[PDB]
Structure 1
Amino acid sequence: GSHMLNAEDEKREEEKEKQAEEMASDDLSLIRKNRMALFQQLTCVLPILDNLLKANVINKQEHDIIKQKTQIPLQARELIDTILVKGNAAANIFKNCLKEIDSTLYKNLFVDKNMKYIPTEDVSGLSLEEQL
């Protein structure tokens, strides 16, 4: 016997699975820091979703659910959540997707290490009944 079997379903299913902190490379820090930028500046949540859907924990169900009645902002939120679960393991897929989808973006993300910011949340245009 290579190893002895040990019960875990006794009391651990409810608890969240432990992530490999050791694996967590620096790239993870960059992704986490650029997390707001990605959510705040999204324009390719589809392309990346397609690439991730190729090989991930989500099947045709979870993928369809976020494609059933979910807008675009939420789609990005769920996609980000999938990265956290996978961890640095998905950093490669995430990075690979951006490189292919937007090679130029990579040259400004990891390379330049300087992400641009824009107040997209700030909007204006109130008019209950203009008649002037």
Structure 2
Amino acid sequence: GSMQTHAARMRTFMYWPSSVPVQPEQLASAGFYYVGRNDDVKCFSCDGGLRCWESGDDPWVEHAKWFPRCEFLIRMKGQEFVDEIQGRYPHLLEQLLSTEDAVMMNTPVVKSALEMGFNRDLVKQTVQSKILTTGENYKTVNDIVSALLNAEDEKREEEKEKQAEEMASDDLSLIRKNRMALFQQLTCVLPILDNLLKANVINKQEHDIIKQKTQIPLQARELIDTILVKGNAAANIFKNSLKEIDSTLYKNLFVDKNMKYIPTEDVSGLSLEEQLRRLQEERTCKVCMDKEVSVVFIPCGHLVVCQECAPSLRKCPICRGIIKGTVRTF
């Protein structure tokens, strides 16, 4: 409970990057403290996490958009304020679970940025991200110019990073692009799982985690995501094993590259609770391989980690998307 006081939260912002336009006082008053990496913050009350703050962001409003049941928020701002924000920006989370001259590229603000010479693709990615993470486009030219400059710097950093780490193989990329189709169509889990163990790509604890799931499809999605997290060596074992197990599936995925996906139902109509129930069922944190998954990444919408492991990740292990916030699954 050490972060329950305003004074304690302010002290954490000692390390806060001075260039972020959102000031420590605004964040701390809204219940957030600095977790110590980048510009990641968490609420002391609800444990909601938000990152990648931009000019014009109001911490109270973002708090209510994403964490409307937080007791601190409700006490400080009132239920009316929370209902108001939820009414203005409805169903932000559910939209994440559902996931070229668009309307968003043609507002006065965005045109003003384009007319200054900002790269059009950069503007598109930055605008798209803004809408998915906040439910709205840029409000002023000063805000978008500041966000675009920051986005340019992040892209440069990403370059250096991606260029210093081992590149994803073709095989890993293929598995990643066909994640959902494989969740649906892979039924031969154990031979592949045994082979990952024998290759020391996974250990016995991790082997047990996947083998003990109670239904084939539950085992299968744990296997696939574990592969995506472990990386190139796991993808290679998967590919080689599949060949011997199911020639038709191997061919579809790695040779003809013609897998067809089709959902049995549009869960998009189910309640948020039920969508999360299904997404979370017998899913184990892919980082610690011990605790249950209990976090949804914003804005990619993936369920991959527990609450203790989330703060350690800059990017989603599944899709490599930059994580801009974390919400609890229950």
CA distance in structure 2 between the partners assigned to 1:34 and 1:71 by the alignment? 21
Work out the CA distance in 2 between the residues paired with 1:38 and 1:100: 17
Structure 2 contact 194–207 (Cα < 8 Å) conserved = no
Identity %: 97
* Counterpart contact for 1:99–1:106, Cα < 8 Å: yes
Contact 1:37 1:117 in 2 (8 A): yes
**What displacement does 1:65 show?**
3.4
**Displacement of 1:118 after TM fit?**
3.9
8 Å Cα contact 1:19/1:87 also seen in 2: no
Is the Cα–Cα contact under 8 Å of residues 171 and 232 in structure 2 kept in the other structure?
Answer: yes
* Local SS of the residue matching 1:4: helix
Unpaired runs of 5+ residues, structure 2, are 1-145, 275-329
Deviations 1:6-51 (A, max 9, x none): 9999999999999984331232221101111110112111222222
The 5 Å alignment of 1:1-132 reads: 21-68=165-212, 70-121=214-265
Q: Which sections of structure 1, spanning at least 5 residues, go unmatched?
A: none
- Give the match's secondary structure for 1:56: coil
CA drift at 1:123: 11
TM-score normalised by the chain length of structure 1: 0.64
Separation in 2, partners of 1:59, 1:108: 29
Q: SS of the counterpart of 1:115?
A: coil
Give the stretch that moved more between structures: 118-127 or 56-65: 118-127
Deviations, residues 44-81 of structure 1 (Å, cap 9, x unaligned): 11222222222234333232233335332221222122
How many residues are treated as equivalent by the alignment?
Answer: 130
Q: Which has the larger radius of gyration?
A: 2
Change in Cα spacing, 1:100 to 1:16, as seen in structure 2 (3 Å) is: farther
1:45 touches 1:76 (CA, 8 Å); kept in 2?
yes
Larger RCO (CA within 8 A; separation ≥ 6): 1
Contact 2:187 2:217 in 1 (8 A): no
Over 3 Å counting, the alpha-carbon distance change for 1:53 and 1:112 in structure 2 is same
CA–CA separation in structure 1 for the residues paired with 2:231 and 2:164: 8
Q: Shift of the alpha carbon at 1:98?
A: 0.7
Distance in structure 1 (CA, Å) of the matches to 2:261 and 2:179: 12
Cα contact 1:108–1:115 (8 A) shared by 2? yes
Deviation at 1:103, TM superposition (A): 2.5
- Cα separation, partners in 2 of 1:129 and 1:65, compared to 1, 3 Å: closer
